[PDB]
Design an enzyme around this catalytic site. Structure first.
Site, short mmCIF file in Angstrom:
data_model
loop_
_atom_site.label_atom_id
_atom_site.label_comp_id
_atom_site.label_asym_id
_atom_site.label_seq_id
_atom_site.Cartn_x
_atom_site.Cartn_y
_atom_site.Cartn_z
N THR B 11 54.72 62.39 42.60
CA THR B 11 54.49 63.53 43.50
C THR B 11 54.36 64.83 42.68
O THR B 11 54.70 64.85 41.46
CB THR B 11 55.65 63.60 44.49
OG1 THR B 11 55.36 64.65 45.40
CG2 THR B 11 56.96 63.90 43.85
N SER B 80 56.47 60.44 47.80
CA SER B 80 56.56 61.78 48.36
C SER B 80 55.20 62.46 48.70
O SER B 80 54.48 61.98 49.58
CB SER B 80 57.45 62.46 47.32
OG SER B 80 57.63 63.84 47.42
N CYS B 81 54.71 63.53 48.09
CA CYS B 81 53.45 64.10 48.46
C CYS B 81 52.32 63.26 47.97
O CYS B 81 51.20 63.55 48.36
CB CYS B 81 53.29 65.49 47.89
SG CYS B 81 54.51 66.55 48.69
N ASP B 208 67.40 59.17 52.32
CA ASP B 208 66.59 60.16 51.68
C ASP B 208 67.06 61.54 52.14
O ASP B 208 67.05 61.90 53.33
CB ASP B 208 65.13 59.94 52.06
CG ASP B 208 64.10 60.76 51.28
OD1 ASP B 208 64.36 61.90 50.90
OD2 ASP B 208 63.02 60.24 51.02
N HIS B 236 66.02 59.42 47.74
CA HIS B 236 64.59 59.69 47.69
C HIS B 236 63.87 58.95 46.56
O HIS B 236 62.71 58.53 46.76
CB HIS B 236 64.37 61.21 47.51
CG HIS B 236 62.90 61.66 47.57
ND1 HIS B 236 62.00 61.50 48.55
CD2 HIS B 236 62.29 62.42 46.60
CE1 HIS B 236 60.89 62.12 48.22
NE2 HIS B 236 61.08 62.66 47.05
N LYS B 237 64.47 58.80 45.38
CA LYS B 237 63.80 58.13 44.29
C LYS B 237 64.21 56.69 44.28
O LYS B 237 64.95 56.18 43.41
CB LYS B 237 64.14 58.78 42.94
CG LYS B 237 63.72 60.25 42.79
CD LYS B 237 62.26 60.50 43.18
CE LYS B 237 61.81 61.91 42.86
NZ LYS B 237 60.48 62.16 43.44
#
Lengths: 262, 258, 258, 262
Positions: B11, B80-81, B208, B236-237
């Site tokens: 991301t 993510s993005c 997350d 999150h990771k």
């Protein structure tokens, strides 16, 4: 009788082609002991924005270290820990800021001296290890017309010679962020020798393993014989990247150094 | 067992390095893995200020796909993005893509503009804590907002359960990035024939701490993936905290789509 | 008659295009001519904000010279600020250069820093009229001042006696540029063995309305060229207003130095 | 009986690969007559900062013209003069701003129609002139997956076919600033036809020379027969770049156009 334990500020300096990232396991281990740690990217290394073809000497390459030492507060001193070719950054820095250095720690590192040319241990390194296997070489002409040789370290050389016993995740990390680098060997050959008052006066601790597959036992012991370190710490096992394969052990030795010099 | 060629896309502000644990895991199962740095990310030589849109930011992925040998297909995994990189890429090379995998990621749709899930993310998590912001004007005159992610936000929100060696690595190589939100707002919607036709697998965890549970469930409800896998725990990771789990889900994606 | 290979270097904000009259003139005498766009100039794809010093700006010239076949030598002709490109280039490739020709140009020296003649220019001509100025911070944190040359300054000071077709061309392709003055102030002085050893021919006219007569005579007095040729009349762009004269002086430079 | 002379605002539009610079002699000649002249670089042309691989259609390429017409004041009208492939920019612009266009002037230009595909005169151009000699071709994949063919016009093609009778200084200028370009022919093939209400209603003047060595007499006359212009002005001699080889003559014809339509 009286025991002593000291907390220090370590500045960790990677070798050419690498970045502050090789210190990502040793930096927390040291902070667990309560030390302050700074890990700097040198010019054109790690995520530093410059490219190597804009850098003209090993001194210019060392700019991030020197800027950081210029900014250290009055009477603050640091122990500079340098791996591999970073002993040359410790020698450059000590001829400008002897004042600010409690000790230089050479971690499977080049150990420059004051009696020969700055390029001298690089010559001997290359005599000892002349073939860098799948490494690729390039050149550019620097600001005063010197031919500078740069290299993109080969992945087999990375696997077998530098990162021999490292985790898959560590070796893969190394491939994901390794950049071009240079020894600037001919500009080091033209350089004023390191001084006795600056670099010659610094305390010097030499950590190494005889299992290093690129800075070989013959080269390492020649360096120790050529310029006697104040202390030598030989780690058993591990590989060239002892801050990855022997992180706790290197942290414990660095505590000893802080007790003795910081 | 299908062995597959996976293209892993980090991301914004990150680089190929966040996949340094997941790429060996997958290679130990005989898969081929490519992990790319997007423009101005990881060790890519460009700086963010010379990039003018998210489509330009995607260039390393699009060039890769441009050169992929004929008849080869890849599974693109975006964290993510990077779901926006999947959607951009899928509209240009639908043909080359066996599936898109969204790993705690934005899941763009075809019905609303390209910035829609960015707006919704920012709505669910508006305060990025110690992140700093900057702006430059791009070549066609738009003001682009860049950011440097704050280390508290990295520690507590992105790398919540990560090892101290991983969090430290993250601070050692993280770079500035941009959502190009306003340029996304002006971009044509993702097409049905390209991005809309791609197979879509959504991997997430409810632990997350930046792509929060109700935003991810909103996303799933807003544009239903072909498959959703929910990993328990982690952060999150997930490619760092649950690397083997993600590798096992990706074997199932390979088995399902080649 | 010596036929020579001339490398023509425009000044900041301009591009190879200002030599469009001089390059055919010289080629009609059997000379080889190369006219390069410097970084972010003419149609070079880079923008000024990604360039961080005058040495980086010189890259097209240095790459050219890097690749010049062994044993070939060139005469580099630089107009206005391009004498700094000559000095940078001469320190890196002294060997490859038969002579530097300064055409209504800055004539750097070895004794004072690289910005010295820029300071002196600005002192002799401090008001660049309708020129606009901008700044960006370069990758090592320095603030770089850029400029967009004002059209009145272009009409009356640079292109004073030029044809209406030439002045119009100038407004159609002129770009932003920078002196990188402050970075020049921090740069090591030009060396004696490189730039100091090069043969140096200075061409000017006293009708130049931006590099004024007393600044050019100062320059000649400050660092005496091997030869000075003074063209009568014309304007700052002698390669446009006195193209044949400049071509004839360059034949004499070729005859003198090969 | 009653004579009329009018001053107009001309917007001059170059063809692909070129820029506003080809108008550098016609723009002063027109201003000598008292006209207002705007000469625009289209996307990725002249010194426009975009690169062609970021442009996805001929419409997107035309953005600078459309932005400029969006900004024209209430009740201001312009005569758009387009050379070579720029007749397609005049057709794009007229379906969005018919209101603001007094006339379209096609200068050795593609003359689109409303009855066929937008790519139709490009097909016919290529049938007439299929070999672009030393021109080099490249591709990229655009935003929705179309293969776009770009070209770097060859210097012999430039010398002999486009700039046949031009001055050495003009041909050399062309080599110094020529850039890559694209016909976007397959995306034009997918495009909605030009409309009758916008582009079909515009006054259309066609200036050409039978000495053009790339838009050949057979092609030019086929275009005139295919979509009758309101006025045709054939210039004797000159070459493809009549705004360089016949600048005054083209300026006098453009005065006539202003008298009649502006």
């Amino acid at each position: 009788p009286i025991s002593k334990m000291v907390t220090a500020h370590f500045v960790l300096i990677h070798t050419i082609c690498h970045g502050a990232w090789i210190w990502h396991k040793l930096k927390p281990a040291l902070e667990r002991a309560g030390h302050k740690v700074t890990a700097l990217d040198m010019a054109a290394s790690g995520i530093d924005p410059r490219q190597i073809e804009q850098i003209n000497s090993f001194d210019e390459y060392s700019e991030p270290l020197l800027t950081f030492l210029e900014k250290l507060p009055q009477g603050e001193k640091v122990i500079i820990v340098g791996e591999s070719c970073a002993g040359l950054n410790i020698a450059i820095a000590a001829d400008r800021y002897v004042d600010k250095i409690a000790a230089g720690v050479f971690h499977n590192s080049l150990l420059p001296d004051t009696v020969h040319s700055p390029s001298y241990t690089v010559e001997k390194l290359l005599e000892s290890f002349p073939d860098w296997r799948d490494t690729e070489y390039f050149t550019f002409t620097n600001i005063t017309g010197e031919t500078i040789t740069t290299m993109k370290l080969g992945f087999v050389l990375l696997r077998e010679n530098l990162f021999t016993k490292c985790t898959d995740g560590e070796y893969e990390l190394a491939k994901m962020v390794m950049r071009k680098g240079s020894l600037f060997q001919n500009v080091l050959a033209q350089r004023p020798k390191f001084t006795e008052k600056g670099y010659g006066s610094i305390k010097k601790v030499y950590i190494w393993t005889d299992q290093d597959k690129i800075f070989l036992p013959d080269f390492q012991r020649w360096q120790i014989a050529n310029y006697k370190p104040d202390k030598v710490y030989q780690v058993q096992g591990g590989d060239h990247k002892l801050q990855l394969t022997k992180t706790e052990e290197v942290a414990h030795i660095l505590q000893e150094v802080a007790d003795a010099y910081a």
